[PDB]
Each structure stands twice: as C-alpha cells, then as structure tokens.
C-alpha cells in the first residue's frame with residue numbers, strides 16, 4: 398500500500414462515510430494493474446460484524462455490467478446477434494409494437510420507453526409475457542434512452558436462451574468461473590451468509606427482495622476482492638485466455654449511442670477521458686426518477702476506446718455501489734457501501750482519488 402494511495406483514499410473516504418452516515422464500506426484501487434484494499438465500519442451493526450475483504454455487498458445495477466458482458470460472450474459465440482429481432486428468441490411475443498425492436502434496443506434502453514421497474518405483480522413466465530405484450534411504447538425504437546430494468550433484464554434472459562442454460566448457470570460457467578470470481582453470487586449460498594452484509598435503509602437492516610428479472614438487472618452480490626478482479630478483467634480483456642469472453646468484454650465497452658457527453662455500452666457507460674468531473678458528477682445524478690433523453694446512433698458502434706472513463710453506479714434499497722476505470726491508465730476504483738447514498742457523492746469521491754493518481 399504505497400503511501401500516496403493510502404493517503405488519498407483515507408482522506409477522501411473517511412469524510413464521505415461521516416457525511417453520508419454510511420455504516421460500512423469497502424474500497425479497491427487498481428493502480429498500474431495491481432489492487433489495494435481498504436475497509437471501514439460495519440457489515441452488521443447489531444452483531445458488530447466488521448467489513449472485511451470477504452464481505453459480500455449487493456451490487457444493484459452494477460450487476461448490469463455482468464449481464465452486458467455475458468451477452469457479449471453469447472454474441473461472440475455466435476449464439477445471438479444484437480441485430481436480431483426480439484421475437485426471434487421469444488416467438489410468443491406477437492404484439493405488433495415489437496416489430497423492429499432488436500436485442501440491441503433491449504440491451505441499451507432504446508426500445509421505446511420500457512419502464513424502469515418490472516411491476517411487483519409480475520412473477521411467472523406467463524405474467525412476464527403478458528406484461529411485455531401489453532406494454533405500449535411512447536417512442537419509435539432507437540430514438541430515446543430511458544434507463545430500465547425491464548429492458549436490459551429481458552436482454553439478459555433472451556441472450557442465454559440458445560445456450561440452454563439458466564441465466565445463473567450461464568453467468569457462473571461463462572463469466573464468474575473463467576475469471577476466478579469465486580465469491581460472486583446471484584443467490585448467496587448458506588455457507589457464505591456469515592459474510593453477507595446487511596443493507597441499511599432508514600436505519601433498518603434490509604436485503605434485496607426477489608423480483609422478476611432480478612438476477613439479470615440487479616441481482617449480483619460480491620466481495621471487494623472479486624470486484625477488483627472484475628475491474629482488472631475489464632481493464633485488460635486481452636489477458637483473458639477464453640476467446641469469446643475476451644471479445645464479450647470488448648463488445649460491452651463499445652459505444653452504441655451518444656447522449657450528451659455519455660456513450661452507452663452493454664451495461665457499462667463511457668465518457669471520453671479526460672473527463673470534466675461535473676459532466677459525470679451531475680451526469681449520473683439519481684435525484685431524477687425518470688430521465689428520457691434523445692440518442693444519436695453511433696453507426697457503426699465504436700470499438701472499446703482505451704481513452705475512456707468507463708463506469709456504472711448501482712443501488713438497492715440498502716446498498717450503494719460504484720465502479721470506474723480508465724483503460725489507458727491501468728487505473729480503476731470500486732466503492733461498495735451498505736447504504737444507498739447520493740450518486741454525485743460517489744462520483745466526486747472516485748474522481749478525487751483517480752485524478753490524484755493519474
């Protein structure tokens with residue numbers, strides 16, 4: 398732990414924890430390719446369990462980066478194409494509004510206004526079909542972006558259909574195991590519950606509740622060590638020996654759409670590096686419950702740009718996560734907390750640390 402990394406991390410994160418009243422936090426800095434770990438506070442306030450390097454956190458929407466990469470791996474295997482119509486993998490989706498909606502539109506929130514949340518009433522495979530059949534798009538496909546679990550969640554479910562595997566089994570076999578992410582889970586096994594932090598919402602200890610397409614949109618739990626390895630893998634995909642996984646990571650960092658200064662990948666979101674912090678700090682703010690934005694198609698998509706700020710925020714009811722990395726600098730950060738605190742404060746802290754080290 399070089400003193401420079403020690404000092405910038407502690408001097409940034411300690412006040413953040415105090416100001417946001419975060420119960421526990423884990424941070425990883427990847428510097429010239431090597432990981433350094435930091436932990437503070439409590440995974441379980443009532444049982445006085447500390448945050449360790451083995452503590453599991455709910456990633457929330459950072460799970461969408463795993464879904465994006467798994468989808469990219471299915472593309473690279475030749476099992477799906479992003480230009481495929483949605484109905485090719487779900488022929489029972491016969492309602493006419495689905496003509497022209499491709500897997501690309503699902504993966505990038507551009508199908509025409511799919512809603513942020515799958516309704517709680519939707520549980521079964523037949524409930525899900527009925528929900529997507531009755532959905533009425535506000536817009537033509539490929540014209541506006543509206544961030545949505547029901548969009549990328551359906552992409553993940555359809556992307557694994559030609560493989561025959563369940564989504565969880567495909568994610569394990571094709572992403573977690575090859576990358577040695579051995580403490581990363583869609584469902585936390587009983588053997589690992591001692592390490593599963595509680596989330597904290599309004600002072601109450603909480604875990605994410607089951608929901609339709611939860612595994613695909615917000616369902617991953619992981620340790621700070623496994624998340625650092627995730628960042629290392631996305632920083633240098635060519636060091637990965639599995640060929641389709643290498644390509645799938647590269648596809649998830651391709652630029653498909655532009656809105657303002659932001660480019661939409663598969664799960665990942667990107668900006669040109671160097672970034673103005675206020676373009677990301679205000680650009681990811683989740684004070685807005687619904688933000689509809691016109692998109693410009695990038696025709697054809699730009700392959701993964703090493704001179705990028707690649708990032709993703711994530712939340713559940715009781716957790717708040719952030720990942721950002723800069724491929725050209727071999728630099729990255731992971732911030733895992735068991736409180737859902739404001740996104741601008743995450744990005745500001747991450748920028749203060751990475752800017753100091755670049």
Ligand SMILES: CC(=O)N1CCc2c(NS(=O)(=O)c3cccc(Cl)c3O)cccc21
Nearest residue numbers: 457458459546614615683710711712713714
């Ligand atoms: C208060 C509460 O209960 N929350 C907040 C977030 C969340 C998720 N995660 S999410 O829908 O995919 C998501 C939406 C929007 C933005 C982000 Cl960054 C995000 O991860 C799942 C279940 C409950 C809750």
